[PDB]
Ligand binder design. Structure first.
Ligand SMILES: *[C@@H]1O[C@H](CO[C@@H]2O[C@@H](C)[C@@H](O)[C@@H](O)[C@@H]2O)[C@@H](O[C@@H]2O[C@H](CO)[C@@H](O[C@@H]3O[C@H](CO)[C@@H](O)[C@H](O[C@H]4O[C@H](CO)[C@@H](O)[C@H](O)[C@@H]4O)[C@@H]3O)[C@H](O)[C@H]2NC(C)=O)[C@H](O)[C@H]1NC(C)=O
Ligand SMILES: *[C@@H]1O[C@H](CO)[C@@H](O[C@@H]2O[C@H](CO)[C@@H](O[C@@H]3O[C@H](CO[C@H]4O[C@H](CO)[C@@H](O)[C@H](O)[C@@H]4O)[C@@H](O)[C@H](O)[C@@H]3O)[C@H](O)[C@H]2NC(C)=O)[C@H](O)[C@H]1NC(C)=O
Ligand SMILES: *[C@@H]1O[C@H](CO)[C@@H](O[C@@H]2O[C@H](CO)[C@@H](O[C@@H]3O[C@H](CO)[C@@H](O)[C@H](O)[C@@H]3O)[C@H](O)[C@H]2NC(C)=O)[C@H](O)[C@H]1NC(C)=O
Ligand SMILES: *[C@@H]1O[C@H](CO)[C@@H](O[C@@H]2O[C@H](CO)[C@@H](O[C@@H]3O[C@H](CO)[C@@H](O)[C@H](O)[C@@H]3O)[C@H](O)[C@H]2NC(C)=O)[C@H](O)[C@H]1NC(C)=O
Ligand SMILES: *[C@@H]1O[C@H](CO[C@@H]2O[C@@H](C)[C@@H](O)[C@@H](O)[C@@H]2O)[C@@H](O[C@@H]2O[C@H](CO)[C@@H](O)[C@H](O)[C@H]2NC(C)=O)[C@H](O)[C@H]1NC(C)=O
Ligand SMILES: *[C@@H]1O[C@H](CO[C@@H]2O[C@@H](C)[C@@H](O)[C@@H](O)[C@@H]2O)[C@@H](O[C@@H]2O[C@H](CO)[C@@H](O)[C@H](O)[C@H]2NC(C)=O)[C@H](O)[C@H]1NC(C)=O
Ligand SMILES: *[C@@H]1O[C@H](CO[C@@H]2O[C@@H](C)[C@@H](O)[C@@H](O)[C@@H]2O)[C@@H](O[C@@H]2O[C@H](CO)[C@@H](O)[C@H](O)[C@H]2NC(C)=O)[C@H](O)[C@H]1NC(C)=O
Ligand SMILES: *[C@@H]1O[C@H](CO)[C@@H](O[C@@H]2O[C@H](CO)[C@@H](O)[C@H](O)[C@H]2NC(C)=O)[C@H](O)[C@H]1NC(C)=O
Ligand SMILES: *[C@@H]1O[C@H](CO)[C@@H](O)[C@H](O)[C@H]1NC(C)=O
Ligand SMILES: [Ca+2]
Ligand code: NA
Ligand SMILES: [Zn+2]
Ligand SMILES: [Zn+2]
Length: 819
């Protein structure tokens, strides 16, 4: 045979069999020549033909008797050649600091991304991916990780390592135009390397700035001098480098002397994304790619075990987004809606945008309003909805950036919107859609001495990973949009312990001093004829200390919302059936909290009594609204935050027909608002065994996701300083265990937050004369959000008096209900 005699022309084996290059032409090569001498230089694995081999120059890794000393063994050398158990076959054993070799005092972090790894892959094809499946079994894994919108590669890869929404880190799509720079960004141009596009601080720099070297293998942004700095080590991108070579480089880095060894690593694979596009998410090509990437990841784990690092490394395996199926018969065309399309440019596909064709000249003069108008409610079954970006659901956080064109189209599942029928980028797989579509969900797995073992966690958003990685490396994170501490339940010993945010503006008292108003405020309730009758009704607002305690216990079961705005004067208004926090400068509530019990009759609430409003004797007139403000303002009317018709006693509706419960509402919005509180709210209450409601106004006129300062609000009621909300929020809170009511809930809570836009038409719902039962609920559902989103937009902090660990409350606050 040719063992240890490769290419030796002098050798003559059994029957004079040859082991030289020219042997294959003669036909007298020994039987094992091809496997011992030729193929042994083109593979990354040891086998029976290679173990103990003589070294050859051109081998990608070695199986020689000295490969461990030279630190060039193939990953599987110890298992294949020395007969030791592989990582794959070893049982799940606990990862701890004892399993770190000398010098690995701090465990390194490996951030590993497999582009386009749909969450559903991990469960349908689990046994086809033994190495990933073992990671899933031994380590911690999430049901899925939610990406950011648009579900694209560069925006989401950069979100992962920054903890920032795309609107903040600047990479809002794989293709974009910046009118200020007057430049184009695309993955085929060198402009992608311009640091002007990349904001925030990526993870490798967070580590490097705090003394920890970072090595990146192909992460989007890693070959950019972000903030003027490259990673300690980085590789120029080339999609042709085999996955095995990338893993091999990573293992070599881990062999470096401690003085030079990185402590933060990133790895990136283009699969299963590439095969998903070619064959679709359910296809032979995807199956093959999933097997490829599982093998490459297995190579990494075997190589780590060879080095005694498999239980020392904190590894994270995730993806940037999922994958769905497109169809050429599921395409919308702009030619069907515009006779002339020459004058605008369109970023086509699952998350399209439209801008002026002649840029930069016409970028701002472009009438984005006309585009969205002319695309709204054109066909009853059209498979996309146009939006001006400030009108997009606020949970997407996709508007505050000049690179995000004002015209947006929100496209239905498995559909595409293109310019004309000349576009043929259809038929395969694609992504970019609503990050809530199950097809768009990504995987998240993790394993290491700092993570919990054999644990499944609930879904979370990829903006949270950045804080987690900083906690793993024990460094401080840059300001980001994660909620630091919401992923502590993944860690054995959290590095950061969160606390309640202390209130910034203390409340004052609006006492019940005089039962008769000093001013009528131009409000009329002729049903109340003489002062005596008025005095009786107003006395109902004058609660004993025992009655205040009683209404708080029921209607504020988790404590009052705390105000984190500075220099905001507010007082609480106590009623038997609701408790509000009244903003004196706004002259309206910042929040109103009431608990709706489960009732025997699911009857719809009749309308509020029409012609009866009066001043609130507890609030001075300078801080109260006047009913004449709304008569004076022709474009808006008044609505109620707490629904008066929900009174549970024969006269308690008077408690809600007061100026302190009024908020400015467009007529058309109030129809939607009233239908929700009259019909849908009662269904929620009976489904959840009662529900606690906290609602209030939101002002975000600069659509940056944060509560506006007074001087940022650009619309007011009549000629007053009473601001007009851009949104209203409604947060439904009940007991996760439906056996308890919201008041008597010792365990976990369950939340359903709404941030409904306050718009003067319901064009977003295309009601076309239909009854509210056919579109209101759909519209609220489309505007669900996280409590955290409500907090950011209001300056309020909820649930501080709910006895429960802070980190668990943060899980509740970052939760997104999905449908
Ligand atoms: C929640 O509150 C509503 C509204 O209450 C009404 O408005 C408040 C602002 C305040 O002025 C209250 O004093 C006032 O009642 C309650 O709904 C009302 O309920 C009453 C009965 O309790 C209804 O009264 C009936 O109205 C009919 C009009 O269609 C009228 O024909 C009836 O007349 C007959 O009955 C009376 C005795 O009740 C008798 O004297 C007459 O001669 C005749 O036989 C009767 O007046 C109101 O219509 C209701 N209004 C609305 C809008 O629904 C509701 O009961 C309350 N909820 C709870 C749980 O207490
Ligand atoms: C809001 O509702 C309250 C009921 O919960 C009303 O309370 C009434 O207030 C009047 C005026 O203060 C009292 O009449 C006076 O009583 C004092 C005696 O004061 C001592 O006792 C009272 C009652 O416990 C208490 O408020 C004091 O702290 C003292 O301990 C006499 O000296 C006066 O001459 C006068 O008669 C009522 O007794 C009181 N009723 C009740 C049931 O508390 C209050 O008036 C309402 N507010 C408004 C603005 O109308
Ligand atoms: C981009 O890179 C620059 C460095 O080239 C970063 O600036 C550096 O920021 C740190 C912390 O913000 C500065 O250190 C601090 O200095 C202050 C004042 O002396 C002190 O109070 C702190 O204890 C700390 O030492 C550092 O001086 C500064 N360097 C320079 C040259 O400005 C910058 O933060 C990076 N930006 C992003 C977004 O990554
Ligand atoms: C997500 O997190 C980022 C980073 O914390 C938030 O962006 C930050 O927003 C603040 C205020 O909007 C910016 O500070 C402001 O800067 C301007 C000019 O630079 C200054 O005039 C203001 O007085 C204020 O200091 C900050 O620059 C910005 N940081 C980055 C990296 O963009 C963002 O708001 C968060 N998003 C949500 C929805 O919470
Ligand atoms: C992108 O990579 C491919 C694949 O080879 C890689 O790059 C080589 C330069 C080397 O570093 C290998 O270890 C990598 O795996 C390159 O294509 C090959 O390049 C080699 C030159 O070393 C050549 O002999 C092969 O014929 C090339 N094969 C093909 C299909 O081109 C390619 O050059 C790289 N592109 C860029 C722009 O660097
Ligand atoms: C945007 O639409 C207006 C109005 O057109 C109507 O509404 C559209 C949504 C569509 O359903 C049309 O069929 C409707 O007629 C356009 O203004 C009209 O333009 C046409 C042709 O130029 C003209 O005959 C009408 O008189 C115009 N009507 C009005 C009220 O101005 C407008 O041109 C459209 N803009 C673009 C860029 O297509
Ligand atoms: C959800 O809660 C119900 C109700 O439990 C009640 O509250 C307890 C604090 C205590 O006061 C019990 O007496 C009450 O029944 C749970 O249902 C009960 O479960 C226990 C088992 O621990 C059983 O002994 C009771 O008979 C059950 N009662 C009823 C009416 O079914 C229920 O188990 C909780 N759900 C979960 C997932 O824990
Ligand atoms: C960015 O890319 C767009 C392509 O969409 C370029 O658009 C051209 O803009 C000029 C005006 O400067 C027009 O005269 C051309 O007709 C446009 N071409 C197309 C195909 O639309 C734009 O020029 C690019 N800008 C930069 C700075 O490269
Ligand atoms: C107020 O009107 C009612 C009418 O029912 C009656 O009590 C009386 O006329 C008035 N009360 C007083 C105290 O003047
Ligand atoms: Ca704002
Ligand atoms: Na009006
Ligand atoms: Zn991708
Ligand atoms: Zn892709």
């Amino acid at each position: 045979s040719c063992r240890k005699k490769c290419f030796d022309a002098s050798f003559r084996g059994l029957e004079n069999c040859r082991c030289d290059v020219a042997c294959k032409d003669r036909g007298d090569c020994c039987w094992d020549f091809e496997d011992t001498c030729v193929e042994s230089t083109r593979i990354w694995m040891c086998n029976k033909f290679r173990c103990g081999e003589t070294r050859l120059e051109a081998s990608l890794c070695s199986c020689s008797d000295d490969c461990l000393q030279r630190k060039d063994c193939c990953a599987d050398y110890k298992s294949v050649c020395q007969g030791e158990t592989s990582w794959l076959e070893e049982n799940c054993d606990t990862a701890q600091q004892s399993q770190c070799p000398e010098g690995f005092d701090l465990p390194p972090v490996i951030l590993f991304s497999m582009d386009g790894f749909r969450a559903e892959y991990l469960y349908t094809w689990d046994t086809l991916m033994p190495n990933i499946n073992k990671l899933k079994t031994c380590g911690i894994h999430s049901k899925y990780m939610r990406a950011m919108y648009p579900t694209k590669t560069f925006p989401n890869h950069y979100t992962i390592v920054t903890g920032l929404y795309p609107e903040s880190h600047g990479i809002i799509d794989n293709n974009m135009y910046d009118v200020n720079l007057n430049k184009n960004f695309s993955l085929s141009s060198k402009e992608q390397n311009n640091p002007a596009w990349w904001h925030g601080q990526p993870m490798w720099l967070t580590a490097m700035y705090q003394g920890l070297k970072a090595a990146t293998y192909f992460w989007p942004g890693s070959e950019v001098a972000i903030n003027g700095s490259f990673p300690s080590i980085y590789m120029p991108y080339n999609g042709s480098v085999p996955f095995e070579e990338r893993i091999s480089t990573l293992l070599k880095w881990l062999d470096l002397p401690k003085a030079e060894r990185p402590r933060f690593y990133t790895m990136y694979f283009e699969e299963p994304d590439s095969s998903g596009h070619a064959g679709g998410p359910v296809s032979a090509r995807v199956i093959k790619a999933l097997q490829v990437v599982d093998h490459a990841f297995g190579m990494l784990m075997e190589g780590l075990k060879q080095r005694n690092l498999h239980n020392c490394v904190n590894i994270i395996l995730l993806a940037d987004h999922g994958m769905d199926q497109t169809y050429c018969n599921k395409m919308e065309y702009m030619t069907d809606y515009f006779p002339r399309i020459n004058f605008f440019y369109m970023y086509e596909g699952p998350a399209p945008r439209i801008r002026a064709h002649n840029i930069p000249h016409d970028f701002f003069s472009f009438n984005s309003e006309e585009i969205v108008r002319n695309l709204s409610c054109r066909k009853p079954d059209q498979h996309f909805k146009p939006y001006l970006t400030p009108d997009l659901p606020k949970r997407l956080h996709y508007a505050k950036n000049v690179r995000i064109d004002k015209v947006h189209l929100f496209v239905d599942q498995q559909w595409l919107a293109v310019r004309s029928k000349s576009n043929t980028n259809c038929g395969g797989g694609n992504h970019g859609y609503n990050n809530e579509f199950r097809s768009m969900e990504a995987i998240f797995l993790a394993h290491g001495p700092s993570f919990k073992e054999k644990t499944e966690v609930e879904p979370f958003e990829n903006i949270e990973v950045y804080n987690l990685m900083c906690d793993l490396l024990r460094i401080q994170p840059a300001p980001n949009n994660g909620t630091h501490g919401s992923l502590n339940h993944l860690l054995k010993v959290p590095f950061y312990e969160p606390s309640h945010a202390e209130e910034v503006s203390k409340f004052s008292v609006c006492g019940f001093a005089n039962p008769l108003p000093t001013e009528s405020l131009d409000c009329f309730c002729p049903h109340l004829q003489n002062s005596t009758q008025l005095e009786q009704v107003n006395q109902m607002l004058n609660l004993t200390q025992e009655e205040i305690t009683a209404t708080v216990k029921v209607n504020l079961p988790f404590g009052r919302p705390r105000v984190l705005q500075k220099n905001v004067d507010h007082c609480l208004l106590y009623h038997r059936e609701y408790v509000s926090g009244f903003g004196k400068a706004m002259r309206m509530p910042m929040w109103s909290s009431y608990t709706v019990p489960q009732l025997g009759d699911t009857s719809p609430l009749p309308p509020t009594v029409p012609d009866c409003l009066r001043a609130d004797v507890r609030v001075p007139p300078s801080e109260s609204q006047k009913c004449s403000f709304y008569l004076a303002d022709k474009n808006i009317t008044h609505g109620f935050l707490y629904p008066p018709a929900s009174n549970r006693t024969s006269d308690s509706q008077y408690d809600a027909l007061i100026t302190s419960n009024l908020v400015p509402m467009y007529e058309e919005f109030r129809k939607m608002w009233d239908y929700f509180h009259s019909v849908l709210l009662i269904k929620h209450a009976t489904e959840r065994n009662g529900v606690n409601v906290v609602s209030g106004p939101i002002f975000d006129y600069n659509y940056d996701g944060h509560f506006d300062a007074p001087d940022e609000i650009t619309k007011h009621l009549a000629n007053t300083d009473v601001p007009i909300p851009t949104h209203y929020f409604v947060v439904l809170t009940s007991c996760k265990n439906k056996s308890h009511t919201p008041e008597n809930c010792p365990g976990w809570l369950d939340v359903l937050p709404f941030i409904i836009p306050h718009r003067p038409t319901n064009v977003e719902s295309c009601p076309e004369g239909k009854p509210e039962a056919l579109w209101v609920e759909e519209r609220f559902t489309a505007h669900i959000a996280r409590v955290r989103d409500v907090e950011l937009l209001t300056g309020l902090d909820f649930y501080q008096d709910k006895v429960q660990p802070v980190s668990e409350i943060l899980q509740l606050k970052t939760y997104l209900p999905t449908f």
